[PDB]
Design an enzyme around this catalytic site. Structure first.
Site, short mmCIF file in Angstrom:
data_model
loop_
_atom_site.label_atom_id
_atom_site.label_comp_id
_atom_site.label_asym_id
_atom_site.label_seq_id
_atom_site.Cartn_x
_atom_site.Cartn_y
_atom_site.Cartn_z
N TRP A 39 4.79 -5.50 7.94
CA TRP A 39 3.69 -6.45 7.77
C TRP A 39 4.12 -7.43 6.73
O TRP A 39 5.03 -7.15 5.96
CB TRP A 39 2.37 -5.79 7.40
N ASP A 54 8.21 0.58 5.68
CA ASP A 54 7.98 1.95 5.22
C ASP A 54 9.20 2.82 5.42
O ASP A 54 9.96 2.64 6.37
CB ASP A 54 6.80 2.58 5.97
N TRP A 104 3.00 1.98 8.84
CA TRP A 104 3.97 1.19 9.59
C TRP A 104 5.32 1.92 9.68
O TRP A 104 6.33 1.46 9.14
CB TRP A 104 4.14 -0.18 8.92
N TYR A 144 4.22 9.16 5.82
CA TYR A 144 4.44 8.10 4.85
C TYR A 144 4.99 8.63 3.56
O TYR A 144 4.37 9.46 2.90
CB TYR A 144 3.16 7.34 4.53
N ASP A 177 0.84 -1.19 0.00
CA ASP A 177 0.00 0.00 0.00
C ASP A 177 0.88 1.24 0.00
O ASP A 177 1.84 1.33 0.77
CB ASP A 177 -0.90 0.03 1.23
N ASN A 203 -2.38 -3.43 5.82
CA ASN A 203 -1.52 -2.49 5.10
C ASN A 203 -2.04 -1.05 4.90
O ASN A 203 -1.42 -0.28 4.19
CB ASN A 203 -1.02 -3.11 3.77
N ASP A 204 -3.15 -0.69 5.55
CA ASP A 204 -3.55 0.73 5.61
C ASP A 204 -2.76 1.46 6.69
O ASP A 204 -2.62 2.68 6.64
CB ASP A 204 -5.04 0.89 5.92
N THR A 228 7.22 2.53 0.40
CA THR A 228 7.31 1.20 1.01
C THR A 228 8.29 0.28 0.27
O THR A 228 8.31 0.25 -0.96
CB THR A 228 5.92 0.54 1.02
#
Ligand code: HEC
Ligand code: HEC
Ligand code: HEC
Ligand code: HEC
Ligand SMILES: [Ca+2]
Ligand SMILES: [Ca+2]
Ligand code: NA
EC number: 1.4.9.1
Lengths: 354, 125, 376, 125, 376, 355
Positions: D51, D70, D102, D113, D26, D98-99, D116
């Protein structure tokens, strides 16, 4: 009626027999040759006018009568802002109510009462003919009718084309008859993009048909006392000119120090400036606005005195939202404005420019 | 949608970038973010400052001085982006320059750009 | 037929011609009514974010609110105020993190409160409406925290100050029920109930496990706070309804959004806010399409409307657009809102016929969350 | 092209949304903003959290465990926006969700963010 | 043929098969070189903005920098550092304004200095490269102030502090010639030489009025600092060239970028960074197309190249895209950087032939300013 | 050769003649019945082991020998981070160099010198035959060659399938011979998503053929002194176990307090835990990590004592980057981690898999 009514007002305007010692007429303090303002010099220059007794001086500067007829009657608009009226403090509703007060003011024409004015009108057979043709017979035998009729005639006379000809260069430019000089157009553009337009335009937006460069509102721009004029008025140094608050009925303490926005028409030829007549030069009245925008030291100085502008006569109620534009007029634009304001001078008073 | 073609004014839609009053607009039309043609959207601040342009009205055939004014204190709306430049002069002639964030005199010293209004101040000349 | 832009052009021309004056000013937004809808734009994880305030009736943007990194928007049902839990940093996306809560006046859009959340406590996530929630009285805002462990922060909107953090079990989401109570959903398949005062270990009680561990409840349940109805879909369109109106969780008969034949043909719910609930009508609206099992966040083109009591399908709307989120205004003869994150467009539908009535485009960069007041 | 069609992995382009390791990615592919497949762009901070997903690799027919990570402290890159959800369970199963941003354990407490990464950590079992 | 994403997939495949272990980490952007290019994104006046760090050779984004409201980028010519003057607010685009200067390390992109500018002095404008400017030694940075009056702020980058405001006449833009001296462009039609000592009024010396009242000079003149060459086009295509290397302004022959029959047939310069200037080659590049006189900010599909000395047109390139801004690398066989604000793409062309080699797409929301380094 | 050398190590491994009073062998402290660890009790319980004199105690816990043959020889990679070796402080390069040190150490097997060892080897006819077949005639007459031969035999025995069979449940599950339990699988999933993986996986990324759950790196997780063991060691109240820094030729004070990341194989049956055997329970070892993540007061408390974990023996060089993940392990995840780590038990120790 209204054609001949003005003719009777024209007789009375230049008649000094409306003053105690017969020494002064409206034309004395409102000289047709000088944009209907006073050329005479008292103890404080041209800042204030001298009364009939040649001794008493006013506290405020004599304004043009030109274009006063376009000022709507005093009222409060839906914004909460007051608009219109007559006298720097709007203490007269309209021209009619205004006309009477000089006649009866001891420090001006100094007639003791309305009865004394009626007596003077009967001295002239010209009046008994003219007055009685418009207001009927016996009008001059009644003090209240005569004084009021004289006020009305004077009002009507000031509502003729002779007082508001719209024959200034601005007027001819807006009619497509001639163009501005590059500097005049620059001045106009500055005038309609800077804070000037917020107070000195008839409207907020759209086209005005008979622009007199005032929104007729009341603002306190934070002017100081006129030292010399104030002494001359004899009202004491402890006295405070509260502007609009001095109008009877106005109690709102937010109107303290606020004066009517004057029409900038003929402004070039009606010095000195502001309510108290403190600024001799027009340029000075423009540069005064920069004390709210300029970070520079000279902005604090009055160029005429060479000394700090002075504390405002009334500190509260300043129109800071408008005045603190975050933009300082440079001399280039101050020049531009002087030029544009000159274009608001009437045909017959163009010669006075120099 | 020919960007370089001569700008053709219309008096039939203020949200379109070809509206006669948007002749020197830069950014976003306020009528798309909660303002209107001559008012600011809620929660933004109206600059006292302005820049002017003589925009031709095709309805009556009369030009009008449009003192544009920015609504400020908000991130850019992202809606109805228009960049017109009829009469737009460079920055050294600021009165006619529109890249400038004309947010001066706005309440709370707001200086961020949101959108722009298009009010008439007179007939041009 | 005549667009809002064309009307204003015609109106303005009349004023000019008639010689009408009007002072330029800051407009007030119209009064918050039932057809006001807020489109929030998490903007695909942008540091700053926009919230559009839209009149659904006209299809007009009547105002906006700037927000920070993945803010959680909340709208007081009564329409008296809006708010969000925003996050800003001293240097755009870097430096000192300031989590804070702003309450705004819903007509001036002016912030009436700015409340600092100490220790940067907000759960940063793709916007789940129920990771930050107003209590029914609009006096407390509750917000979720995942790090260093699931917790729930309490914010006093009345006195304008952060209260405390509530330590909770391995549970998620916040659906406030009372001014001092809210439910979460737990890993073990249970809902947790959380009663909290101004101090003390909160009274934390678990329901029975209400679904298999291989049955996956989506991240965007519809919660009608005024109805205490928690509409929670599974990946398969099977929908768990939990009633919380008694202050305790009682589970409803599960309904299948899709027929068995459709489920063999590969129909499944998909999108962001996949499900919507109309309170007055007791209808569940679900974004569905033909898709693979693991394409559950992709947009959908169909909305199945089903009666929440019976599970009976009432309509299967062909939206004619890639719709990621649906929601409804809670007025009668409701609008169906269809937010295309792709098209950046709110498609405003008649929720009865499914006809696209109008649309408000240019709603940011990746608008995901629709929010409406429940005013009636 | 078909958003709803079964995800078709490929081991021939990482900046593509159908790259086999991005099976539950994501946000944005770090490779597209100054990072690489398994490294962060400069200036950003590498989160220690992660994750997992079991992604099938069609090169060797073996499924591998991708513990995504991330890169944080930066506004979202806005390059190669991708959203895949193979084996992606809801938030209550955070280790497959994955929303979530992280960004935990990232240096200088960076939590914005940016993008990733997709590194392998084992095999499917 | 093989894209950078494809070669990466093949590397990862071999690493897996071979069993190469490797530690995840923060990459260093490769050493700054002449081919590195910075594309700023004012984002159509958004409160936050992005600068992309791009390797023009590879056609690859090697890093990014976040910025505030219309921040002014400045790339040090020697690539020792980069910096911008930026504006953040406490609440996105509202609240207390903080104007600050940030210096960054050119390989880690970490801020090496964060200098607050007092009293929010930055001039806020659609980004104009030379409204904020580095002195040749890169010790001082200068930025323009329009409000309350035209002025110039002095910032010490070495000492990492703001110095003071230099009030000046009605002049605009800043072109540093020395560690204490810079030029500006005034309304009267002259330039202004501004020498600023330790303190006091600066030594303000106007040049002669070198252009008419009715001649309009663009907001994006090219300025090579190491050449001391100020390239200033007019709306019509006419170009003013000023040599400032001597310490004073020599006005070079007024060169015409467009032919008489071209200007007659509606050809004109238009765009944002309308003009680029190669130092070594002494060539002027100019965005042009058939447009009406008042469409002077729209994109252009052509780029004329002319010899700065003689004015002979060296070539005209059909760009094949709507280009708003152009710039060039200062190395040999330089790249013509062509930035479409619409496409959000940096089309990287060969500046000899004008052929498109590669393109870096997704460069923000409305990228306007290209900035190269003059390293060689 | 390779078959027979290991056979000689087997002999030596269990032979008590390599101890001064002849009471002790490798097997003694490294019991094959307990994953090659010490089941014996001392003054510090099972924290530290008692030497051949029956009095002298070590300051560190006896580790397993299982999968110790998988650890690279001590080295330092381009990161500047040390890896591999033998001993908790990695002061031994490899299994061969390691083997000699127990024999000579006064607090352990306490043989006065290499000569005394050789003189023991000669007295066995089996060795004279066995040693002389692998290392040639006279090997036992030379103390240096005899001592080192014995060591290499001991290393060779330790590299055999016996010490590293990879027949744990994990190994069977990674083949698909059988599945994880759901709890183990969650344990596995947490292990490979949380900070454990950063230190207790052979690799940073990719896959390992013979995984033993250690990057073989040296970290200071901030453990306190085990006062009971420290007292029995007799090193004193002022003594600080500097860990890796105590290795000769390691001067870098940033290595003070750092210890070899242990293999987690057979961890379920090799307690007590850490270098100084400070935690009896496998669970306490896991909970210790929550002290760097959890806001809760409980995380600062050692459950086995009820008191704070303690001031780190060495307060500097803590792996906070790794340890401060900003995510606390709930009890569910701990239960799961315990279950996963239990799957790392070798087949023949599944019976021993207790507590
Ligand atoms: C409202 C906030 C105002 C703005 C903005 C400007 N002016 Fe003004 N002006 C205003 C008032 C209420 C008055 C009366 C003065 C008093 O006694 O209080 C004035 C006066 C002038 C004058 C004097 C002319 C006269 O007849 O005496 C001039 C020449 C004048 N103002 C010019 C002017 C210019 C050029 C402005 C923009 C820079 C400007 N004014 C702004 C109210 C306001
Ligand atoms: C008790 C008196 C012991 C006897 C007899 C032997 N060993 Fe040992 N060993 C013991 C302890 C307390 C430790 C840890 C010491 C430290 O400083 O870290 C060790 C260590 C080893 C190691 C290193 C393993 C690792 O670090 O993972 C090996 C390979 C080892 N020991 C093997 C071994 C052999 C072959 C023995 C007979 C010659 C032997 N040990 C005897 C305690 C005791
Ligand atoms: C590096 C920063 C580490 C992380 C992250 C984790 N562990 Fe660890 N562990 C590490 C070291 C250097 C050591 C030895 C420390 C010492 O000085 O004694 C350990 C020890 C353990 C043990 C005990 C094994 C034994 O005594 O034989 C266990 C059971 C263990 N570690 C498990 C574990 C888990 C489950 C983790 C994630 C929660 C974890 N460790 C993180 C280094 C590091
Ligand atoms: C000399 C002393 C006189 C005489 C004889 C008259 N006026 Fe006038 N006047 C004078 C002053 C100093 C002022 C300003 C006073 C104040 O505002 O307090 C005025 C004001 C007016 C106004 C108001 C105009 C405006 O505010 O724009 C009018 C309409 C006016 N005066 C008219 C007028 C007439 C008709 C006169 C003869 C009857 C007359 N005045 C006499 C000074 C003097
Ligand atoms: Ca006057
Ligand atoms: Ca142990
Ligand atoms: Na209930």
């Amino acid at each position: 009626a209204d054609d001949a009514l003005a003719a009777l007002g024209a007789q009375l305007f230049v008649d000094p027999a409306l003053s105690r010692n017969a020494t002064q007429s409206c034309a004395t303090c409102h000289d047709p040759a000088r944009a209907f303002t006073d050329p005479r010099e008292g103890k404080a220059g041209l800042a204030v006018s001298v009364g009939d007794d040649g001794q008493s001086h006013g506290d405020r500067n004599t304004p043009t009568l030109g274009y006063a007829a376009l000022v709507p009657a005093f009222h409060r608009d839906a914004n909460g802002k007051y608009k219109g009226g007559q006298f720097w403090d709007g203490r007269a509703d309209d021209l009619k109510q205004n006309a009477g007060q000089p006649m009866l003011n001891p420090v001006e024409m100094a007639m003791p009462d309305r009865a004394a004015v009626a007596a003077r009108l009967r001295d002239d057979p010209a009046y008994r003919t003219g007055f009685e043709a418009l207001f009927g017979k016996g009008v001059l035998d009644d003090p209240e009718r005569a004084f009021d009729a004289a006020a009305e005639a004077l009002a009507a006379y000031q509502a003729t084309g002779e007082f508001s000809p719209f024959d200034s260069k601005y007027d001819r430019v807006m009619r497509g008859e001639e163009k501005f000089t590059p500097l005049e157009e620059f001045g106009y553009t500055v005038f309609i993009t800077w804070n000037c337009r917020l107070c000195h335009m008839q409207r907020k937006q759209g086209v005005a048909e008979r622009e007199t460069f005032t929104n007729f509102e009341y603002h306190n721009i934070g002017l100081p006392v006129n030292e010399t004029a104030r002494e001359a008025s004899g009202l004491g140094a402890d006295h405070v000119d509260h502007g609009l608050l001095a109008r009877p009925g106005i109690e709102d303490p937010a109107q303290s120090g606020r004066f009517k926005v004057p029409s900038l028409r003929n402004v070039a030829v009606t010095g000195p400036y502001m309510h108290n007549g403190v600024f001799t030069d027009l340029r000075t009245a423009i540069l005064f606005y920069n004390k709210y925008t300029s970070r520079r030291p000279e902005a604090k100085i009055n160029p005429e005195t060479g000394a700090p502008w002075g504390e405002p006569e009334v500190a509260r109620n300043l129109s800071l939202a408008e005045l603190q534009s975050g933009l300082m007029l440079d001399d280039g634009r101050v020049d531009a404005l002087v030029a544009f304001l000159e274009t608001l001078t009437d045909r017959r008073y163009e010669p006075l420019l120099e | 949608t020919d960007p370089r073609a001569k700008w053709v004014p219309q008096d039939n839609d203020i949200q379109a970038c070809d509206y006669w009053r948007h002749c020197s607009i830069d950014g976003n039309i306020c009528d798309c973010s909660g303002g209107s043609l001559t008012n600011c959207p809620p929660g933004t601040k109206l600059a006292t400052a302005s820049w002017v342009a003589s925009c031709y009205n095709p309805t009556d055939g009369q030009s009008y001085l449009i003192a544009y004014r920015d609504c400020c204190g908000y991130n850019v709306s992202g809606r109805c982006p228009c960049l017109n430049t009829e009469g737009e002069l460079p920055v050294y002639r600021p009165e006619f320059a529109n890249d400038i964030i004309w947010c001066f005199g706005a309440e709370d010293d707001a200086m961020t750009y949101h959108c722009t209004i298009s009010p008439i101040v007179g007939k041009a000349s | 037929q005549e667009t809002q832009g064309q009307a204003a052009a015609r109106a303005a021309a009349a004023d000019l011609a008639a010689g009408q004056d009007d002072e330029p000013r800051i407009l007030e937004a119209p009064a918050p009514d039932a057809r006001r809808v807020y489109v929030n734009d998490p903007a695909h994880f942008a540091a700053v974010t926009q919230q559009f305030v839209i009149d659904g009736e006209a299809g007009r943007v009547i105002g906006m609110i700037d927000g920070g990194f993945l803010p959680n928007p909340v709208v007081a049902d009564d329409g008296s105020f809006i708010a969000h839990a925003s996050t800003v940093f001293s240097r755009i996306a870097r430096g000192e993190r300031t989590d804070y809560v702003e309450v705004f006046d819903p007509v001036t859009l002016l912030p009436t409160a700015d409340i600092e959340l100490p220790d940067a406590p907000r759960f940063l996530v793709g916007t789940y409406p129920w990771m930050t929630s107003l209590t029914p009285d609009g006096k407390t805002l509750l917000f979720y925290q995942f790090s260093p462990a699931p917790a729930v922060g309490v914010v006093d909107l009345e006195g304008k100050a952060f209260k405390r953090m509530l330590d909770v079990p391995d549970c998620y989401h916040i659906f406030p029920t009372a001014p001092d109570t809210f439910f979460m959903h737990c890993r073990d398949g249970s809902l947790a109930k959380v009663a909290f005062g101004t101090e003390g270990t909160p009274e934390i009680t678990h329901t029975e496990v209400f679904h298999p561990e291989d049955e996956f409840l989506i991240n965007h349940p519809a919660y009608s706070q005024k109805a205490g109805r928690l509409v929670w879909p599974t990946y398969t369109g099977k929908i768990h309804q939990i009633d919380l109106s008694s202050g305790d969780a009682k589970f409803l008969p599960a309904v299948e959004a899709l027929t068995e034949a459709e489920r063999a043909d590969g129909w499944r719910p998909g999108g962001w806010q996949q499900v919507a609930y109309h309170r007055a009508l007791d209808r569940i609206y679900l974004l569905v399409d033909q898709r693979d099992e693991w394409r559950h966040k992709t947009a959908s083109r169909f909305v199945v409307v089903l009666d929440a009591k019976t599970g009976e399908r009432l309509a299967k709307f062909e939206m004619g657009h890639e719709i990621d989120s649906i929601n409804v205004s809670q007025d009668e003869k409701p609008l169906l809102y269809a937010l295309s994150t792709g098209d950046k467009t709110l498609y405003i539908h008649d929720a009865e016929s499914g006809e696209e009535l109008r649309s408000v485009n240019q709603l940011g960069h990746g608008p995901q969350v629709i929010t409406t007041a429940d005013m009636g």
